[PDB]
Amino acid sequence: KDISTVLVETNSGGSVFRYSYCADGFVNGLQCKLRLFDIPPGVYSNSEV
Amino acid sequence: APVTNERYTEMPLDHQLILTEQFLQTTMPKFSVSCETYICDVSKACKNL
Ligand SMILES: *[C@@H]1O[C@H](CO)[C@@H](O)[C@H](O)[C@H]1NC(C)=O
Ligand SMILES: *[C@@H]1O[C@H](CO)[C@@H](O)[C@H](O)[C@H]1NC(C)=O
């Protein structure tokens, strides 16, 4: 129906192997904010709506 | 100065207090900018460009 803005990991050959759509949940929203997939604990500033 | 070989040293007869207020700038508000949403708003046609 509409656009998506998914995060993409990629292995040594340039091939994608993990992903996470940004609108599936809430935690992957800030995964799409700061380009890190399994984000460590901490305060993360300035996440928009 | 350290005194020797006696001389006509002048000494003060009375002092006065002097307040010398001295401003040293030490803080500024920490910022968390987001250039993706500053330079262009909710328009997606910026963010792919
Ligand atoms: C990608 O990361 C893995 C993990 O260390 C490494 O073995 C591999 O060599 C890396 N790919 C390249 C092209 O350096
Ligand atoms: C102490 O000695 C110095 C050098 O010998 C001299 O100039 C000075 O006048 C002497 N002090 C007095 C009080 O004479």
Ligand SMILES: *[C@@H]1O[C@H](CO)[C@@H](O)[C@H](O)[C@H]1NC(C)=O
């Ligand atoms: C020197 O300082 C003292 C203390 O403030 C004051 O009473 C006195 O008048 C001053 N002398 C002159 C010549 O201003």
